Amino acid sequence: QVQLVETGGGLVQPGGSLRLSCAASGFTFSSYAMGWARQVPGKGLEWVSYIYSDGSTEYQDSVKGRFTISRDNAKSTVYLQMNSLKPEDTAVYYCATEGSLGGWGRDFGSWGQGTQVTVSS
Amino acid sequence: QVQLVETGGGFVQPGGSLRLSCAASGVTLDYYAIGWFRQAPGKEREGVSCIGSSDGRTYYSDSVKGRFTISRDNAKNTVYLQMNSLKPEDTAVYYCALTVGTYYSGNYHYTCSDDMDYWGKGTQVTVSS
Amino acid sequence: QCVNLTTRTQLPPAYTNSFTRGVYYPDKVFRSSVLHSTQDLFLPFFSNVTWFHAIHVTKRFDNPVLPFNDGVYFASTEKSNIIRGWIFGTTLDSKTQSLLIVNNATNVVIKVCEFQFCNDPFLGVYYWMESEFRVYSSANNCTFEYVSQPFLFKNLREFVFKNIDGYFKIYSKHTPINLVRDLPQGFSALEPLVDLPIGINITRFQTLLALHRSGDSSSGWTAGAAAYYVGYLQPRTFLLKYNENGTITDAVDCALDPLSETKCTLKSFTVEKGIYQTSNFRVQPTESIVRFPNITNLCPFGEVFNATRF
Amino acid sequence: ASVYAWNRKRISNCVADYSVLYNSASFSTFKCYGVSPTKLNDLCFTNVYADSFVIRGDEVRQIAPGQTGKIADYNYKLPDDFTGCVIAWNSNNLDSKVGGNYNYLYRLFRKSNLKPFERDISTEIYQAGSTPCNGVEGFNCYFPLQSYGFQPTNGVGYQPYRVVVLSFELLHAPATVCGPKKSTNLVKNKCVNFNFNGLTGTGVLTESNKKFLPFQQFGRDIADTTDAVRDPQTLEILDITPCSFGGVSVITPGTNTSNQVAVLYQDVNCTEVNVFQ
Ligand SMILES: *[C@@H]1O[C@H](CO)[C@@H](O[C@@H]2O[C@H](CO)[C@@H](O)[C@H](O)[C@H]2NC(C)=O)[C@H](O)[C@H]1NC(C)=O
Ligand SMILES: *[C@@H]1O[C@H](CO)[C@@H](O)[C@H](O)[C@H]1NC(C)=O
Ligand SMILES: *[C@@H]1O[C@H](CO)[C@@H](O)[C@H](O)[C@H]1NC(C)=O
Ligand SMILES: *[C@@H]1O[C@H](CO)[C@@H](O)[C@H](O)[C@H]1NC(C)=O
Ligand SMILES: *[C@@H]1O[C@H](CO)[C@@H](O)[C@H](O)[C@H]1NC(C)=O
Ligand SMILES: *[C@@H]1O[C@H](CO)[C@@H](O)[C@H](O)[C@H]1NC(C)=O
Ligand SMILES: *[C@@H]1O[C@H](CO)[C@@H](O)[C@H](O)[C@H]1NC(C)=O
Ligand SMILES: *[C@@H]1O[C@H](CO)[C@@H](O)[C@H](O)[C@H]1NC(C)=O
Ligand SMILES: *[C@@H]1O[C@H](CO)[C@@H](O)[C@H](O)[C@H]1NC(C)=O
Ligand SMILES: *[C@@H]1O[C@H](CO)[C@@H](O)[C@H](O)[C@H]1NC(C)=O
């Protein structure tokens, strides 16, 4: 039914920048809101960013001012950009979709494959 | 990360005996239920017999008639079911599946439904006169 | 578990007079050198209030279940702390929320929930350490609970209990007393003590006291000398004199005397010589009368209803 | 606990700090229905009910009004008119056990669905088979509960999720549970517009030598105007005075004579507005 694909994961240079895309399918991308989350191995899941259907974006404080999220309505694809990514951001990022329509707040009903990023030098 | 192989299907005249094997490898569930579900053209898939990993207990349906016997072997991690006095109305495809067991009241209870957590492609058996 | 206490002779109820008593601060507003007229639920001046004794002399162990109409003034003249607690509610039979205030030995417990109250819930102190506590048998679904700091006739306690706008209000005051009986005259305002957001209906209340024990449990006890007075509050207007300290020193009932009502209208305690239009007089009707004309000419309903050729 | 028997917690006689509760890293889902998730602190409610349990990551979707499925139909049903926040966070780190966790159970089959806010303590062995099952476990007679079986190796959304559903209920009493209600620093000797514990106004605040009684907060003078207020934090009494208002009057010797004027500001000690007092 609902399928989520994420591209852009890999190794990160000190101070490098990465772009992640999540091309959803099987449902209405414009109405539903997208979200991104990270999971460090050995620790629980931790959301990193969120976006609403009205263009609003939410960012977690530990990564506030360094994470960028937006929408591509032409292609219905959500993008996550990490600028000045810190070496302590070694986690697996997941693309999530809203489980419903009504209600206000973050809604992570579905999860994607997830892209693993680790620091190498 | 689990792979299942089902063997023992074929076409044969009524009266013969058959054995069905469902090998399981790479399974991570400590306790699981394995059952056989029959499906035929013009017919709905339904279970016939099931086995339990905790103690080897078995469940029999109307199709068993006290004839089908299931003996899971840890030697090969394969479930073997024997069929005696196959009937023409029994022509169907047998499927094996893995379901997570239930622990309640200090005991392992096994539940089988229309939907299995894991599924595999079984074999079709034809009993033609 | 609680057991009914026998050996109690019935005596007629006794009444005494409240000599300018039961006045409290109605709000949290400071007022200095002003005469303020406030309309609220008060205890009328020079009103007669029910008196309950506790004396060995029968034994006068009277703890009725008194009505709680709109508010209750509860005074207690004691020297050895006989009475301690209160039980409030509507049914008091585990069918509705019931309030419980207890001060047995160390703290004060305020709990709202259903209890299986019996006919004679009491406390007992052996002879001095508290030993017995027989008030309720169960406490199932409790909403509010509170505790205060631990601790361990000549004393006059005054309380006012009120319940309005979903809030339960307690006012209190303590005063030295050196006099035998009958609620000595004077004035003392009651400062607010607690305002609990309980939001339940309390229409019937009881009282709790500790008895003294030194024969059988249902026969051997000492009530201990104490006196507690109960009065009710109804809506009246009062005229309160605030000191420059900010305290209430005098009050005028505005409805007991012609002179009191004149003072309350003039907004002054001292009134000079003259004639003052104080209020209005209306003789209210005591019956309702309707005199519609004679009734006749009813409809031929029988033709419509019977319709023999239906 | 597991979803088949969900605890029903009640919180009272304290203040809910939902700001820091929101901006929490672990909580993946903070969906609030009927209310503003941020602005709920200003909102005041009487009793809060917490409906806490652990479910599968793909089932967190099912906790919503008017949703069908398994958890909604058989385990835990929110009402159509549900108001409150459903909070869900992954707890794969502590609840999953190596080899599979069998201590978390959910109702798989049942004779009838569930009305909103209902719990099913009873777990007698199910009977669907038209033959009288006579208290036997087997085919057509399976045990209603089934175990999640969490492994740390399982899928990205199969892991356990701890979910607490807060429903806000108002009784026949004014709201008693509120939010932080933050304050600002206090300034004297310059007229500001103020909100002291719900008392709103505008004036210059000064130290007051009048002594209040401990219980009373503010004070009126004659004609029912606040003249002093007690600071909720430091418990000190502040006198209130309305800052200068007045009339301006223009003193003119006549346009025929000259256009030079004087201005009189009335009742204003105008070291604050040649100048002559
Ligand atoms: C037709 O309808 C009239 C309705 O008034 C019937 O009157 C009954 O009259 C007797 C005589 O007192 C009353 O006790 C009954 O109560 C009346 N009926 C009802 C329903 O109240 C009359 O009986 C009916 N039938 C005939 C014979 O015309
Ligand atoms: C006390 O007497 C009342 C009289 O109705 C009775 O209902 C109650 O059970 C008695 N309680 C005890 C403890 O004897
Ligand atoms: C009030 O109580 C007193 C005290 O017994 C009694 O004498 C009097 O008759 C009662 N009624 C009035 C109106 O005073
Ligand atoms: C407390 O009262 C509520 C409402 O009447 C009721 O549902 C609940 O069962 C009561 N508590 C107990 C332990 O019975
Ligand atoms: C109090 O009585 C009113 C009048 O019927 C009722 O509406 C309300 O629910 C009652 N409250 C309690 C706590 O019993
Ligand atoms: C407060 O009352 C006391 C005693 O009645 C008095 O001595 C004192 O002067 C009063 N306070 C002021 C500010 O006058
Ligand atoms: C009504 O009729 C009665 C006849 O019984 C008569 O006596 C009476 O005067 C009449 N009343 C009026 C107001 O007409
Ligand atoms: C908190 O309030 C109390 C009064 O309730 C006050 O004494 C205390 O100073 C306040 N806290 C701080 C840090 O000032
Ligand atoms: C007033 O105006 C008239 C007309 O311009 C002029 O003749 C006269 O001198 C003026 N008087 C004064 C006092 O300015
Ligand atoms: C105006 O304010 C000054 C500044 O303190 C003061 O000295 C003066 O007396 C004030 N004038 C009045 C109060 O009339």
C176 and C186 Cβ atoms separated by less than 8 Å = no
Rounded to 10 degrees, the C-alpha dihedral C264/C270/C275/C279 comes to 10
The answer to whether D146 touches D59, Cβ cutoff 8 Å, is: no
Q: How far apart are the first and last CA of chain D?
A: 78
Cβ–Cβ < 8 Å for C90, C114:
no
Q: Which helix (H) or strand (E) is D19 found in, with range? A: helix D18-22
Contact flag C30-D218 (C-beta cutoff 8 Å): yes
Contacts of B77 (CB under 8 A, 6+ apart): B23, B24, B25, B27
DSSP strand E in A8-100: where?
18-23, 34-39, 45-51, 57-59, 67-72, 77-82, 92-97
Tell me if chain D has a CB within 8 Å of the CB of A6: no
Chain B residues within 8 A of D100 when measuring between CB atoms: 28-31, 100
Residue A74, both tokens? 């032409």
Q: Is D256 in the pocket of ligand 9 (CB under 6 A)?
A: yes
> E strand or H helix at D227, and its extent?
strand D226-230
Closest residue in chain D to residue A98, using alpha carbons only: D61
Chains contacting D (3 or more CB pairs within 8 Å): A, B, C
**Whether the Cβ atoms of residue C242 and residue C36 lie closer than 8 Å to each other:** yes
All residues at 6 or more sequence positions from D217 whose CB lies less than 8 Å from its CB, including other chains? C28, C29, D196, D197, D199, D229, D230
- How many beta carbons lie within 10 A of that of residue A93, not counting itself? 24
Those residues with Cβ within 8 angstroms of residue A33's Cβ, 6 or more apart along the chain or in another chain: A50, A51, A52, A53, A97, A98, A107
- Contact of B92 with B83, CB cutoff 8 Å: no
CA distance C307 to C57: 84
Whole-number Å distance between alpha carbons of B52 and B34: 6
Q: Domain B3-127, CATH 2.60.40.10 — does that match?
A: yes
Q: Is C245 in the pocket of ligand 6 (CB under 6 A)?
A: yes
From C95, C97, C196, C201, mutation site for ligand 5 pocket: most ligand atoms within 8 A of C-beta: C201
Q: Taking Cα atoms as reference points, which of D7, D48, D41, D6 lies closest to residue D23?
A: D41
Ligand located closest to C5 CA: 2
Contact D33 A104 (CB under 8 A): yes
- The whole-angstrom separation of Cα D166 and Cα D84 is 5
Of D220, D227, D236, D237, whose CA–CA distance to C26 is shortest?
A: D220
Ligand 7 center from residue C294 Cα (angstroms): 6
Instruction: Determine contact, residues B117/B98, Cβ cutoff 8 Å.
Output: yes
Task: State in Å: Cα D255 to ligand 9 middle.
Answer: 10
**D81 has which bridge partners?**
none
- Please check whether residue C94 is in contact with residue C116, taking contact to mean a CB–CB distance below 8 angstroms: yes
Identify the bridge partners of residue D90 per DSSP, sorted by sequence position.
D161
Beta strands across the sheet bearing D237-241: C29-30, D218-220, D226-230, D237-241, D199-207, D192-196
Contact C223, C59 (CB under 8 A): yes
Q: Of B50, B103, B112, which has the smallest distance from its Cβ to D102's Cβ?
A: B103
Whether chain C lies against chain B with 3 or more Cβ pairs closer than 8 A is no
User: Does the beta carbon of D269 sit less than 6 angstroms from any atom of ligand 10?
Assistant: yes
* D213 with C198: Cβ contact below 8 A: no
Looking from the CA of C273 toward its CB, the CA atoms found within 13 Å total 0
Q: How far apart are CA C32 and CA C244, in angstroms?
A: 4
Q: Are C63 and C178 in contact (CB under 8 A)?
A: no
Instruction: Tell me which residue of B63, B71, B88 sits closest to B20, measured CA to CA.
Output: B71
- Give the residue among C62, C41, C38 at the shortest CA–CA distance from C52: C62
Please give the span between the terminal C-alpha atoms of chain C, in angstroms, as a whole number.
Answer: 72
- Name the residue with tokens 């004036």: D203
Amino acid identity, position C31? R
Q: For residue A87, what are the contacts with CB-CB under 8 A and spacing of at least 6?
A: A12, A14, A119
Closest among D107, D120, D11 to D55, alpha carbons compared: D107
The residues, any chain, with a CB within 8 Å of residue B66's CB and separated by 6 or more, are B60
Residue closest to A81 by CA, chosen among A63, A69, A64: A69
Interface of D with B (CB under 8 A): 99-100, 102-103, 105, 108-109, 123, 137-140, 142-149, 151, 153
What distance in angstroms lies between residue D270's CA and the mean position of ligand 10's atoms? 9
Which is the CATH superfamily of the domain at C14-281? Spike glycoprotein, N-terminal domain (2.60.120.960)
C255-258's contacts with Cβ under 8 Å and 24+ in sequence apart are C255/C44, C256/C44, C256/C45, C256/C46
Distance of alpha carbon D149 from alpha carbon B62, whole angstroms = 30
**Whose CA is closest to D75, among D56, D48, D95?**
D56
For residue D139, which amino acid is it? F
| The two three-digit tokens of residue A6, written as one number | 């994420």
By CA distance, what is D25's nearest residue in A? A46
> For residue C248, what is the enclosing H or E element?
strand C248-252
Ligand nearest to the CA of C166: 5
Contact flag for D and B (3+ C-beta pairs < 8 Å):
yes
Tokens of D267: 């009742």
Residues constituting chain B: 129
CA atoms within 13 A on the CB side of C185: 6
List Cβ neighbours of D167 (8 Å cut-off, separation of 6 or more): D48, D49, D51, D82, D83, D84, D117
Angle (nearest 5°) at CA D223 between D218 and D229: 15
- HEC profile of B36-52: EEEECCCCCCEEEEEEE
Residue ranges covered by each domain of chain C: 14-281
How far is C102 from C157, CA to CA, in rounded Å? 16
Q: What is the CA radius of gyration of chain A?
A: 14
User: How many CA atoms within 13 Å lie on the side-chain side of C301?
Assistant: 3
DSSP D111: S
Contact A9, A115 (CB under 8 A): yes
Q: Which of D8, D9, D176 to mutate to test the interface with C (most CBs of C within 10 A)?
A: D176
Of C107, C153, D128, nearest to B111 (Cα)?
Answer: D128
Whole-angstrom Cα distance, residue D84 to residue D72?
Answer: 17
Report the candidate in A60, A56, A44, A45 with the shortest Cα–Cα distance to residue D24: A60
Q: How far apart are CA A39 and CA A47, in angstroms?
A: 8
| Mutation choice for B interface testing from D101, D123, D145, D147 by most B CBs within 10 A | D147
Residue the block writes with tokens 């719990």? D119
A103 touches chain D (CB under 8 A): yes
Q: Which tokens hold the place of D14?
A: 């304290």
Closest CA to A21 of A69, A53, A55, A59: A69
Residue in the structure block whose two tokens are 């004659």: D222
Judged by its nearest atom, the ligand closest to the C-alpha of residue D212 is 6
Whether the Cβ atoms of residue D231 and residue D184 lie closer than 8 Å to each other: no
| Interface contacts (B, D; CB < 8 Å) | 61
Positions of chain breaks in chain D, given as the residue before each break (C to N > 2.5 Å): 273
Q: Whose CA is nearest to atom 14 of ligand 3?
A: C48
- DSSP letter assigned to residue D69: S
Do residues C203 and C96 make contact, with C-beta atoms less than 8 angstroms apart? no
Q: Candidates C291, C294, C295, C297: which one to mutate for ligand 7, based on the most atoms within 8 Å of Cβ?
A: C294
Location of structure tokens 């000549």: C154
Closest CA to B102 of C78, A43, C113, D123: D123
Q: Which chain D residues are closer than 8 Å to B102 by Cβ?
A: 102, 105, 143, 145-147
Ligand nearest, relative to CA of residue D172: 5
Check: CB of residue C238 under 8 Å from CB of residue C255. Answer: no
Kindly list the domain boundaries of chain B, sorted by start residue: 3-127
Triad D249, D251, D253: Cα angle to 5°: 160
Of the candidates D127, D152, D153, which has an alpha carbon nearest to the alpha carbon of residue D140? D127
Which ligand lies nearest to the CA atom of residue D169 in the structure?
Answer: 4
Which chain C residues touch D11 with a CB distance below 8 Å? none
Tell me the helices (H) and strands (E) count for chain A, helix number first: 0, 11
| Method by which the coordinates were obtained | cryo-EM
- Breaks in chain C (C to N > 2.5 A) come right after 57, 127, 152, 214
The C-alpha torsion from D98 through D103 and D104 to D105, rounded to 10°, is: 130
Q: Are D18 and D27 in contact (CB under 8 A)?
A: no
Identify which of D208, D209, D211 to mutate to test ligand 6's pocket (most ligand atoms within 8 A of the CB).
Answer: D211
At residue C305, the 3 state secondary structure works out as helix
The distance from CA B85 to its chain's CA centroid, rounded to whole angstroms, is 17
Superfamily name and number for A3-119 = Immunoglobulins (2.60.40.10)
Write the CB contacts of C257 (distance below 8 Å, at least 6 apart in sequence): none
Q: Is B35 helix (H, G, I), strand (E, B) or coil?
A: strand
CA dihedral of D205, D206, D211, D213, whole degrees rounded to 10 = 20
Report which residue type is found at B112.
C
- CA–CA gap between residue A56 and residue A33 (Å, rounded): 10
Contacts of C171 (CB under 8 A, 6+ apart): C24, C25, C159, C160, C162, C190, C191, C192, C193
**DSSP characters for C95-123?**
SS-EEEEE-SSS--EEEEE-----S--EE
C113 contact D CB<8A: no
Place of tokens 């999220």: A69
3-class secondary structure, C302: helix
Domain ranges of chain A: 3-119
Q: Cα–Cα–Cα angle for C47, C49, C55, nearest 5°?
A: 150
Q: How far is the C-alpha of C240 from the C-alpha of C25, rounded, in Å?
A: 9
Residue D8 near chain A (CB below 8 Å)? no
- Alpha-carbon distance of C247 to C33, in angstroms, equals 9
Amino acid (one-letter) located at C74: F
CA distance A21 to A27: 17
3-state secondary structure D36-105: CCCCCCCCCECEEEEEEEEEEHHHHHHCCCCCCCCHHHHHCCCCCCCCEEEEEEECCCCCCCCCCECCCE
| Three-state SS at D93 | coil
What secondary structure letter does DSSP report for A66?
T
DSSP D115-170: -SS------PPP--SSS--TT--BTTB--SEEE--B-TTS-TTTSEEEEEEEEEE-
Which uninterrupted H or E stretch holds C263?
helix C258-266
Kindly list the partner chains of chain A, i.e. chains with 3 or more CB atom pairs below 8 Å: D
Atom of ligand 1 nearest to the CA of C306: 1
d(CA A39, CA A9): 14
Asked if D139 lies within 8 A of B61 by C-beta distance, the reply is yes
Q: Which of B101, B98, B117, B116 is nearest to B46 (CA)?
A: B116
Tokens of D203: 């004036």
Q: With the C-alpha atoms ordered D215, D220, D226, D227, is the resulting torsion angle positive or negative?
A: negative
C26 at the D interface (CB within 8 A)?
Answer: no
3-state secondary structure of C260: helix
Q: Half-sphere exposure of residue C93, counting CA atoms within 13 Å on the CB side?
A: 3
β-pairing, C122-126 vs C248-252, is unpaired
Per-residue three-class SS string for D183-206:
CCCCCCCCCEEEEECCEEEEEEEE
Distances (CA, A) of D202 to C256, D210, D223, D240: 42, 20, 18, 9
Strand partners, C140: none
Cα separation, C114 vs C95, in Å, equals: 7
User: CA end-to-end span of chain B, whole Å?
Assistant: 41
β B11-12/B123-127 pair status: parallel
Distance CA D238, CA D226 (A): 11
Question: Phi, psi at residue D185, to the nearest 5°?
Answer: -70, 155
Task: Give the separation between CA A102 and CA D23, rounded to whole angstroms.
Answer: 21
Q: Which residues of D touch C194 (CB under 8 A)?
A: none
The candidate with the shortest Cα–Cα distance to C28, out of D229, A10, A9, D125, is: D229
Q: Say if residue B67 is exposed, middle or buried (CB neighbours under 10 Å; 0-12, 13-18, 19+).
A: middle
User: Structure tokens of C223?
Assistant: 């009530």
Q: D218 and D199 in contact (C-beta within 8 Å)?
A: yes
Ligand 7 lined by C294 (C-beta under 6 Å): yes
d(CA C213, CA D65): 62
Distance (Å, rounded) from C-alpha D152 to C-alpha D99?
A: 9
Give D209→chain A minimum CA distance, Å: 47
- Report the distance separating Cα C140 and Cα D83, nearest Å: 27
Contacts of C297 by beta carbon, 8 Å cutoff, 6+ apart: none
Within 10 angstroms of residue A116's Cβ, the number of other Cβ atoms is: 14
